[PDB]
Amino acid sequence: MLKIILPSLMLLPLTWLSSPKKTWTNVTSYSFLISLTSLTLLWQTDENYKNFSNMFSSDPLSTPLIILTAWLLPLMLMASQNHLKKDNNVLQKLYISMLISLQILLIMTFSATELIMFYILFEATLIPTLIIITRWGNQTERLNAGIYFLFYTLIGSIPLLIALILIQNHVGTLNLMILSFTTHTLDASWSNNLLWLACMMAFLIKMPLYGVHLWLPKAHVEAPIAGSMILAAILLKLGSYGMIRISIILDPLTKYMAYPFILLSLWGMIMTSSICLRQTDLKSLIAYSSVSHMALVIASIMIQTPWSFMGATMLMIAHGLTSSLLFCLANSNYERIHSRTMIMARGLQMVFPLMATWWLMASLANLALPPSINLMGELFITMSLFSWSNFTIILMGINIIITGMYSMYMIITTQRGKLTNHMINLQPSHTRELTLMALHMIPLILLTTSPKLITGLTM
Amino acid sequence: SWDKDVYPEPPSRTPAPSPQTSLPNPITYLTKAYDLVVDWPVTLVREFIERQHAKNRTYYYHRQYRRVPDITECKEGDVLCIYEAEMQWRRDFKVDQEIMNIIQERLKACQQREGENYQQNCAKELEQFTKVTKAYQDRYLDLGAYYSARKCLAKQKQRMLEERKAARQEA
Amino acid sequence: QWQEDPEPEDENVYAKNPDFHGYDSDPVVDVWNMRAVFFFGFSIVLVFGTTFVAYVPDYRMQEWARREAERLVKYREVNGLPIMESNYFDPSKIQLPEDD
Amino acid sequence: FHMTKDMLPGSYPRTPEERAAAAKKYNMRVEDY
Amino acid sequence: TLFQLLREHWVHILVPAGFVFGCYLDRKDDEKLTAFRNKSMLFQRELRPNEEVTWK
Amino acid sequence: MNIFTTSILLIFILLLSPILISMSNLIKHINFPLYTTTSIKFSFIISLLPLLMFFHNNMEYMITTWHWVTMNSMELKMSFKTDFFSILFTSVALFVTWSIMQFSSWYMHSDPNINRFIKYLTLFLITMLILTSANNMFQLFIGWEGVGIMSFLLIGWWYGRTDANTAALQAILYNRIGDIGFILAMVWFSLNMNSWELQQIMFSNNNDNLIPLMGLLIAATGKSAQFGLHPWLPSAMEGPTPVSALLHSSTMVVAGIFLLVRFHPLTTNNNFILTTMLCLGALTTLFTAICALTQNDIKKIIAFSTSSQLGLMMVTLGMNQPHLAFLHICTHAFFKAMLFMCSGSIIHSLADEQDIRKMGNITKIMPFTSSCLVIGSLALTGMPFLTGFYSKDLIIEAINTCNTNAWALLITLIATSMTAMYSMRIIYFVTMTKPRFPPLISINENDPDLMNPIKRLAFGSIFAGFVISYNIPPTSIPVLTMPWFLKTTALIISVLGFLIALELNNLTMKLSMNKANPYSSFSTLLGFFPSIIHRITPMKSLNLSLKTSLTLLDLIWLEKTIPKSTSTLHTNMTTLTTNQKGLIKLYFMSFLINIILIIILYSINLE
Amino acid sequence: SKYKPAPLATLPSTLDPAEYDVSPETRRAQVERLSIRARLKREYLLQYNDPKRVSHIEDPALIRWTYARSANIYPNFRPTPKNSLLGAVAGFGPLIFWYYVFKTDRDRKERLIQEGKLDRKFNISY
Amino acid sequence: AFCAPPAYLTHQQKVLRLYKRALRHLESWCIHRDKYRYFACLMRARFEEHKNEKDMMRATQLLREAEEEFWQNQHPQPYIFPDSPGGTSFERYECYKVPEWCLDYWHPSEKAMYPDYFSKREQWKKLRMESWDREVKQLQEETSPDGIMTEALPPARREGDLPPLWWHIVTRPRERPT
C-alpha cells in the first residue's frame, strides 16, 4: 500500500517545488500513473484477501473504492483549471494539496484494518473538504454549508468513537480480521440497541439518510466542482463501507433495529426523486438524485444479504462515476453563464452537439438503462428487497418511474428546445472538459464489460 | 475436449435424407459452397496456429489444497485454526456454487434438446436439480452476507436438534 | 459607497488563441498539458491497465472452482455418491447437547 | 452580489406602502398585486 | 542552458523515488512478518534442496 | 450447428458495421444511407438461410456466445433463442427496414443530420433483434429499454417542437410503467427458479405464476399500447413517418405480444391471465377503432388501426392461440408499413399536409401510391388470399368457436367492421373526392427510392401470408367445421362496414349541416382519456412534489426540528450563561451558593 | 349545455364578461399594463441589440423566482396548527403504514418458515 | 407576429376575428368546397344582418351570444395550417435556426472556406457599430412624456440613419434553413 501512498505524498513536493507553469501537468500525469499503480490490487487469484501489514489491507470491497479515489484526482485537477486560472500560484498549489490530501486520507481509510485509523481519517477528510468549500465557493452560503457538513458528521461520529472504545475495552482489539472470527451474539437489550445506534448513525448521516440529508445539497450547491465530485463519489461511499465493515459485530440486532431505517430510506427515495422534478437548481437536482440512490444502498446494507451487498457495491461505484460526470457537465455550462438554474440555458444541443451525447449517456446511466452497472445494482437490490418483503417493489417501481422522469426533464429542458439567442457567450466546448466526460464514461463501459470486479466480498 | 461424464450429451440419432421431389434443396448446395469457401481457409489457419502451439508448448496444473482441521476441531478464540478452516469453507462454498451451476446448465441443455417432450425425458436432470437444491438450501441458505463456517455449523446444529427431537418423540 | 474594484468583464478565451484546448492561456503549456493528459489517461492507463486486468488469471478462484467442481461431480457420479450432502460437517465431529 | 435585498422577495407586506414597493419591485401594477 | 534545464525537470524523480521507497517498505514489512513461513497446516511442505526459503 | 449459428451472428455483425463506421472519418466521404441499406439487404438475404433450414427440419437452437459474469450460483450469458418466432421476425423486420431505409433516403433528403437518422434506425433494429432473439430476460430487458430510448430519440428528432419532446417523454413514462412489471417478473423468477433463462423457467409450468404473469402483462400493456397505456402511440406521430412505419407500427409496439408469445407455456395453465388478456385486447380494439372513425390526421388513423390490431393479437393470446398472434404480427407489418409510406409520399408532395380534408383525389394524381394504399387497406381488412386474410380469418374463427366472453367476441366483430369503415374513410377523403389542396402542383412520385420499397412491400402484402402459412409447421389445430354464418362472418362484417361508411360519406356530401354530436366528440377526442388524465395526474404529482415533499419537509420542518432547534437552544443557553453584570458581589454570592450546595451534598451522602 | 369552467379547463376569455368591457377604468388599467410591458421590452432590446455586449442578459425576475422558491421560504415560515399537522402526517404516516405492511408480511412469512407449510423449492440465492 | 397587439381589443376587431374563426371551423365541418361556399354565404348573411346596428349595449350582447354559439357546435379537431400553432410542422425547423453570433467562434480554418461571406459579415458589423448610438439617441429623444408607451418602433427619420433596433429583425434566421 505504501507503493500507492508514498507517491501520493511526493506529489505534494512535486506540486510546490514545480514552476508555476508546469505544476498542473506534472501532478496530473503522475496522478494518472498512481491510478495505474493502484490496479495491482485487482490481482486476487484466491479467496485470501490481501493483508500487507498490521494496518493496511485491501479486500474486494476496498479495492474498487481505492481505484476510484486514485482515478478521480486527475479529473478533479482538470475540472479545477478553468476556475483558479485567475488565482495566484500559491492558491492553486494549496487547492491541489487539499485534493491530494483527500486522496491520501481516503486511500488510507479504505486500506485500514483497524476502525480507529478508519475513524481518525474519516474525520480528517473534513478539514480539506471544508476548506475547499468555504474558500473557493462563490456564494455566501458557503459558510452555513460548511457548518452543516461539519456538525452533522461530528454529532454522528462522537457516539461512534464511544462505541469503538467500548468494543475495545470489551474485546481487546478493534481489528477487523479478529472481530470477525471472534464474535458473539449480542443479547437483545436497550444498551446494545444504543450501541447499534452509535455505530450506525454516523454513517447513516454520511450516506445520507432521508431525515438527515440537508447538509448534502447545501454543500454540492455551494461547493466548487472538485469538492462536489469527490463528495458525491467517495465521501458518501465512506458511510456504506463503514456500515458493511461494522455490521458483523451487531448481529442479530440488525434484524429488528433496521425497519426504521429501511423504511425511511425506501420512502425518502420517492420523496427525493420527486423533489428532483420541482427543482430549479441543477446541482440540487443531482444531489437529491444522489440521496435517492444512496437510500437503496442503506436499505440493502440493512437487510445484509449477498445479492444486497453486491448490488450496493455496484451502485456505489456507478453512482460515483455518473454523479461526478453530471456535476462536470453542469459546471461546463455554469462557466459560460454563471448561473445554476436549469431554465436559462435550454437549447444547448444546437451549439454543443457532442457535449449533449455526454448528457444523454449520463442521464441514461442515472436512470437504469441496461446493461449499465447502475442498473445491475438497482436490480439485485430490488431482488433482495422483494425476497425481504414482496411489497417493496411498489416503491422501487415508482422510484424508477420518477427517475426516468426527472432525468429526461433535465436533458430536455437543458439541451432540447429553442436556443436562448441572447447567450452570445456560449463558447464551444473545451478539449479538457470533453476529456473529462470521456474519462468518466469509458470506465463505465469497461466495468459493464467486466462486472466481476465491482461485486464485493459476497461474490 | 470436454468430458461427457460431466456434461453428458446423448448420441443424436439422426434421420437420413428422403428426397421425394425433383427440385434441388438450396441448403445442401449453399452448404457445400459455404464449406469450401469458409471452413477450408479457417481450418487451414487453425492447423497453422495449432502447429505453432505444438512448437513452444506450455503446461499448467490444477491447484490441489490439502485438508486441514475444520472449525469443529478449532477452539473459541484461536484465530489461526479458524482462519484456515474459514478459507477452506469459502473454497468449498465456491465449488458448491459451481456444481449447482453445472447442474442448471445440464437441465437447460436437456430441456432444449428434448423440446416439447421435456416433461418426459428430462425428469432425471430435474430430479438431480431438486436434490442438490434441497442440499444447498440446507447447508448454505439462510446465512447472511457475512456467511462463515460458524454460521453454517450453528444452522446444521439447530437442524439436527429439531430432527433429533422429532425422532426421540414418537418413539 | 466603499471602495472595491468593479466586477470584471467575461472574456472569450478563443479570441486571442483560437487553437485553445481549455488548460492554460500560454499555448505551449496548453498543448503539452493536453498531450500529457491524453497520453497518460488513454494511451497508458485505459490501455495497459485494461490489459493487465483482462489478463488477471483465476480471479478470486473462479476457474479453479469450476475445474474442481468438474473433478468432483465426475468422481461422485462414478463412485455412486451424491453431488451434495445436506450436512457440511461430518456429525462425528459434532457433539450435540445431552439435553434432558 | 448583483441584486440587492430591496430588489429580492421578502416578508409579507402589511403596510400599503410596502405593497406598493413590492408591486413596483415585481414590475406589477399595484392594483394587480 | 544546463542549470535552467535542471532547476526544473529535476522534480521528475520524486514520485518514482516514492514508488521505489514504498516497495522497499512493503518488503520490510514482509520481512518482519515471517513467523509462519512454511509453518502453515496448508502450504507446510518439505523443503527442496538448495531452497533456503519458501519466500523472502 | 455451424452454418446456422454463423449466419445468426453475421446478421448482427452486419447491422453493427454501419454504426462502427459512423464513429469513423469515412462517413464524411462515403454515402452512408446507401451503405446502410445495402447492409440491411445483405443481412436479410443471409437471414433467409436459417429460415429455410427451419422450414425444412423445424429445429431450433440455443446459442450461448459470451459469458458475461458468474454471480454465485447464477450465471449470466449472452444466449440466443433462434426459434420460429425469432427467425421469422428477424427476416420480416429486416425486409421492412430495408424498405424504410430507401424511403428515408428519399423522404429526408433535406435533413442535414440524415446520417444520424439512419444510425438511430439501425440501432433500434439491433435492439429489436436482441429483444427478439434473446434466451435470457436480462437481454430481453436490454432490448426493451433500448427500443424505448430509441423511440425517445426518433420521436424527438425535431428538438425545437415542445410537442415532440412531450410525446417522447410520454412514451418513456408509459413504457417504464411496463418496465415495472417486467422487473417484477425478473425478480420472481430469480428467487423462485434461480435463472432468467427460459429453459429453466419452463419448469415453473406446474406452479402458481400469477405474479410474474401479471408483470409481463403490464409490460405488454405498456409496450403494445393497450387501453390503460395507449395514448403514447398516436402521440408518437410527431416524428418523421419512417419512424412511425418502423417502430410505432410494426416492430416495437409488437414487443409485448411477442413477449407474451414467448411465455405461452405458462399462460395455458392460468385462466385469470387469459381472460384479462382477452378483455384488455377487445377493449383496446373497440376503443381505438372508434377513435379512428373521426380523426382527420392520416397518421393518427394508421396508428389507431395498429392499436386495434394489437388488441386483436392480445385477444388471440387470450384464447390460447399464440402462434396465430405471431403470424398476424408477421403479416401485419407489410401492409401497415406500406400504408405509412404511401402516406409519407402524399405528405412530402403536398408540403407536409397531413389532414385528409386537404388531400382530395389521389388516383388521378398518384395512381401508383394510390394502388399500393388500396392494397394495404385491403390486406388490413380481410380481402381473401392477401396477407391479412391468412391470419385474421383464423382469428375470427377461433374467437367465434371457443368458450369466450360474449362481450369480447361482439366488440371484436364490431371493431373489424370499424376497421373496414375507417379504411374506407381514408380511401374516400384521400382517393375518391375532388381536390381540396392548394392550387400549385409540385407532385413527383417517380424517384426509384420511393417506388421500389413500396412495391416490394406490396408483393409482400399480397403473397407473404400464403407463403408463410404454407411453409410453417402445424402448431395448433384449427376448427374447420362451423356454420356458414361463422366461416363467412369476417367477410360479411368487413363488407357491411364498407357499405355503411360509403353511405355515410356519400351523405356528408350533401348540403345539410354537420353537428357536434356527443357520441363523436368522444371519438374525435381520444375518449377524453388524455384530456383529463394527462393534466390531472401530473398536476397532483408535481404539486405534491413541491408542497409536501420539498418545501414543507426539506426546507421547513426538518430544518426547524433538528438544526434550527439545536441552534436556538444553544444560543439561548448562551444568552443565559454569559450575560452577566460584571459585579463581584454577585459572583461571590454564587460562590456561597456553591459552598452550601457542596456541604449539603456531603452531609446527606456521608457524615 | 353551455361551457362550465374548471381549474384546469379554464374560461377562454371569450365567455368572460371582463373582456366585453368598455369601462374607462378597465381600459386605463390595460393601458398601464401595456406601458409597463413596452418599457420592459425596450429595456431588454437595448441590450439584445447592443453590439458592445459580450455576455448574456441577466433576468432579475428569474433570480427572484429562485430566491423565493428556495431561500425566502424559512424566514417567511411560521408554525401553525395546519402546517404542523400536514407536516406530521406527510412525515410519519406513510412510514407507519409501510411499517405495519412489512411487519405483518414478514411475521406471517417467518411464522410459516418456522412452522413449515411454505415451500421455497429452488430459492438458492436470496 | 411582426406587429405587437394593442392595449385592448376593439369591438370591430373582435367581430372580425369571430368571423374568421367561425368560417374556419365551418370549413372544417363543411369539408367539401361547395358546401363550405354555401354555408359561408349563409354566415356572411347572418353577420351582415346586424351590420348597421348602431347601439353598443345590444352589439356586445349579440357578440357574446355569438361567441357562446361558436363555442357550442365547435369542431373539436379543426383544421390548423401545418406551419401554424398546433400544426405538424410548427417548430420542425427551429432546430436548424442557428443564430449568427455562432460564427464569431468559428475557427479560421472553417472561415477560409467562406471568405467573401465573412468580409460581407464584417461590413455588416461595422454598419451596426456605427448606427448604434444614433438610433439609441433617436429613441431616447422621441419618447412621449405622457408616460404611456406603445411597444412599436419608430423609423429612421433622419437620412443616413438606420431604423432603431434592426439587427434582430434583420439577420433573423430563415424559415426553412437546410
**How close G109 gets to chain C, by Cα (Å)?**
23
Radius of gyration over every alpha carbon of chain G, rounded to an integer in angstroms = 30
- Tell me the residue ranges of DSSP E strands in F44-161: 61-71, 74-82
Nearest Cα neighbor of A396 from F184, G104, B145, F169 is: F184
Contact E11 A52 (CB under 8 A): no
Write out F499-568 in H/E/C secondary structure: HHHHHHHHHHCCCCCCCCCHHHHHHHCHHHHHHHHHHHHHHHHHHHHHHHHHHHHHHHHHHHHCHHHHHH
Question: What is the rounded CA–CA span in Å between residue H69 and residue G11?
Answer: 15
Give the whole-angstrom CA distance, residue H178 versus residue F4. Answer: 46
What lies within 8 Å, CB to CB, of A32 at 6+ separation is: A74, C37, C40, C41, C44, C45
Residue in chain A lying closest to B65 (CA): A46
Burial H122-142 (b: 16+ CB within 10 A, else e): eeeeeebeebbeebeebbeee
Helix (H, G, I), strand (E, B) or coil at A40: helix
Domain interval for residue A176? 2-459
Shortest distance, CA G14 to any CA of chain D (angstroms): 21
What DSSP character marks residue H160?
T
Phi and psi dihedrals of F62, rounded to 5? -135, 120
Asked if G121 lies within 8 A of B129 by C-beta distance, the reply is no
CB count, 10 Å around CB of H33? 14
Could H105 and A350 be called an inter-chain contact, meaning their C-beta atoms sit closer than 8 Å?
Answer: no
Q: Which SS3 state, helix, strand or coil, does residue F269 take?
A: coil
Among candidates B139, B160, B159, B146, which has minimal Cα distance to B92?
Answer: B139
Q: Specify the amino acid at residue H48.
A: E
User: Among F274, F396, F288, F338, which Cα is nearest to F99's?
Assistant: F338
For residues A165 and A171, give the distance between their C-alpha atoms in angstroms, rounded to a whole number. 10
DSSP line for A426-458: -----HHHHHHHHHHHHHHHHHHH-GGGGS-TT
Total residue count of chain A as it appears in this document: 459
Sign of CA dihedral A347, A349, A350, A352: positive
> What kind and span of H or E run contains A57?
strand A57-58
Residue F76, φ and ψ in degrees, nearest 5: -125, 125
The answer to whether H96 and H174 have CB atoms below 8 angstroms apart is no
Residue F383 backbone phi and psi in degrees, to 5: 45, 75
Residues F315/F395, Cβ–Cβ less than 8 Å: yes
Whether B124 has its CB under 8 Å from any CB of chain C: the answer is: no
Distance CA H124, CA F507 (A): 62
**Burial of F391 by CB count in 10 Å (0-12 exposed, 13-18 middle, 19+ buried)?**
buried
Residue C13: all three cell numbers together: 478565451
Q: Residue G33 in contact with residue D29, Cβ under 8 Å? A: yes
Which residues, other chains included, contact A220 with Cβ-Cβ below 8 Å and sequence gap of 6+? A228, A231, A232, A283, A284, A286, A287, A290, A327
Half-sphere exposure of F215 (CA within 13 A, CB side): 19
**Backbone φ/ψ region at H20: left (φ over 0), alpha (ψ -120 to 50), beta:** alpha
Nearest to E11 among A1, A14, A53 (CB): A14
Burial class (CB in 10 A: 0-12, 13-18, 19+), G108: exposed
Given an 8 Å threshold on Cβ–Cβ distance, is B146 in contact with A248?
yes
Site of grid cell 363555442: H71
Joined together, the cell numbers standing for residue F362 give 389521389
Report d(CA H118, CA H106) in Å as an integer. 11
Beta-carbon separation of B156 and C84 below 8 A: no
Which cell numbers hold the place of F73?
450460483
Chain A residue with minimal CA distance to E19? A3
Q: Compare CB distances from C58 to A24, A45, A446 and report the shortest one's residue.
A: A45
Nearest CB among G32, G33, G68 relative to D9 is that of: G68
Sort out which chain A residues have CB atoms less than 8 A from F541's CB and list them: 274, 277
C-alpha cell at A75: 479529473
From residue F177, alpha-carbon distances to A211, A446, C57, F267 in Å are: 28, 30, 42, 22
Cα Rg of chain C (Å, integer): 34
Yes or no: say if A305 and A384 are a contact pair by the CB < 8 Å rule.
yes
Q: Which chains touch A (3 or more CB pairs under 8 A)?
A: B, C, E, F, G, H
> Is H94's CB within 8 Å of F162's CB?
no
All residues of chain G having their beta carbon less than 8 Å from the beta carbon of residue A263 are 95, 98-99, 102
Question: Is A280 close to G70, i.e. CB distance below 8 A?
Answer: yes
Distance CA A60, CA A453 (A): 8
How far is Cα A232 from Cα A206, in angstroms, rounded to an integer?
A: 10
C85 touches chain A (CB under 8 A): no
Examine residue A208 and say whether the peptide bond preceding it is cis (omega within 30 degrees of 0): yes
Three-state SS for chain C is: CCCCCCCCCCCCHHHHCCCCCCCCCCHHHHHHHHHHHHHHHHHHHHHHHHHHHHCCCCHHHHHHHHHHHHHHHHHHHHCCCCCCCCCCCCHHHCCCCCCC
> Which of A:378-417 have CB within 8 Å of G?
384, 387-392, 395
Residue F595 buriedness (CB in 10 A; 0-12 / 13-18 / 19+)? exposed
Chains B and E touch (3+ CB pairs under 8 A): yes
**Smallest Cα–Cα separation from F259: which of F271, F267, F270?**
F267
Asked whether F551 and A214 are in contact (CB, 8 A), the reply is no
Q: Which three cell numbers stand for residue F351?
A: 408540403
Place of cell 437504469: A368
G80-to-C13, F175, F544, G86 alpha-carbon distances in Å: 54, 42, 19, 10
Q: Any idea of the CA torsion for A379, A383, A384, A385, to the nearest 10 degrees?
A: 100
Report the C-alpha gap between E47 and H130 in whole angstroms.
96
The residue type found at F417 is S
In A312-438 the beta strands, taken as DSSP E runs, fall at: none
Query: For E1-56, where are the alpha helices, taking DSSP H only?
Result: 3-6, 14-32
Cell of B148: 462463515
- Three cell numbers, residue B107: 437441465
Could you give the 3-state DSSP secondary structure of residue F64? strand
Task: Tally F–H CB contacts below 8 A.
Answer: 72
- Residue F407, CA atoms < 13 Å, CB-side half-sphere: 8
Q: Is some CB atom of chain G closer than 8 A to the CB atom of D7? A: yes
Instruction: Report the neighbours of B using a cutoff of 3 or more CB pairs below 8 angstroms.
Output: A, C, E, F, G
Tell me if residue A175 falls in helix, strand or coil.
strand
**At which residue does the C-alpha cell 388531400 appear?**
F359
Candidate from G29, G63, G68 with C-beta closest to D31: G29
Query: In whole angstroms, what is the distance from residue F272 CA to residue F275 CA?
Result: 5
Cβ <8 Å between A308 and B145: yes
Please tell me which residue of chain H has the smallest CA distance to A417. H95
**Pseudo-torsion of CA A334, A340, A343, A344, nearest 10°?**
-50
Of F161, F436, F514, the CB nearest to H29: F514
Instruction: Say whether B72 and C78 touch across the interface (CB within 8 A).
Output: no
Of C67, C74, C86, the CB nearest to B135: C86
Q: Residue A336 and residue B115: Cα distance in Å, rounded?
A: 63
> Closest by alpha carbon to F185, among F144, F228, F218, F142?
F218
Are the beta carbons of H148 and G32 separated by less than 8 Å? yes
Q: For residue H77, give the nearest of F112, F353, F524 by CB distance.
A: F524
Report the domain count for chain A: 1
Calpha distance B19→C19 (Å, rounded): 73
Beta bridge partners of F76: F69
Rounded Cα gap, residues A175 and A4, in angstroms: 22
- What resolution in angstroms, rounded to 1 decimal? 3.0
Cα G29 from chain centroid?
30
Show the DSSP H helices in chain B as ranges: 26-34, 40-54, 79-114, 123-140, 149-168
In the numeric block, the cell 505551449 is attached to C28
Which of F159, F509, F524 lies closest to H32 in CB terms?
F509
Distances (CA, A) of F236 to B169, E5, F142, F249, F304: 70, 66, 22, 10, 11
Identify which of F454, F270, F421 has the alpha carbon closest to the alpha carbon of residue F346: F454
Query: What is the DSSP code (8-state) at residue F202?
Result: G
Contacts of A22 in chain E (CB under 8 A): 8
Amino acid at G52: K
Q: What is the DSSP secondary structure assignment for residue F350, as one 8-state letter? A: T
Task: Name the residue among C33, C60, C62 with its Cβ closest to that of A60.
Answer: C60
Chain E residues within 8 angstroms (CB to CB) of chain B: 40-42
**Residue extents of the structural domains in chain F:** 2-524, 525-606
Is the link from the previous residue into G60 a cis peptide, with omega within 30 of 0? no
Residues of F in contact with A390 (CB under 8 A): 211
C-alpha span between F398 and F411 (Å, rounded): 15
Residue in the block written with cell 484466491: A46
Q: How many CB atoms lie within 10 A of CB A50?
A: 18
Q: How far apart are CA D4 and CA C84, in angstroms?
A: 77
CA atoms of A130 and E26, how far apart (whole Å): 33
Chains B and C touch (3+ CB pairs under 8 A): yes
G74 interface with A at CB cutoff 8 Å: no
CB A418 within 8 A of CB F193: no
Among F53, F74, F202, select the one facing B27 at the smallest CB separation: F53
The answer, for F159 touching chain A at a CB cutoff of 8 Å, is: yes
Residues G18, G5: Cα–Cα separation, whole Å: 15
Asked if residue F156 lies in contact with residue A349, where contact means CB atoms within 8 angstroms, the answer is: no
Cα→Cα distances H138→F369, H127, H156, H157, Å? 60, 17, 8, 9
Interface-testing mutation among H90, H104, H105, with chain A (most A C-beta atoms within 10 A): H105
Residue partners of B82: CB distance under 8 A and separation at least 6: A181, B71, B74, B149
* Residues of G whose CB is below 8 A from D32: 29, 33
A157, F240, H83, H92 from H89: Cα distances, Å? 60, 11, 5, 5
Cell 531452497: give the residue: E51
What gap in Å lies between CA G59 and CA G48, rounded to an integer?
12
Chains that touch F (3 or more CB pairs under 8 A): A, B, G, H
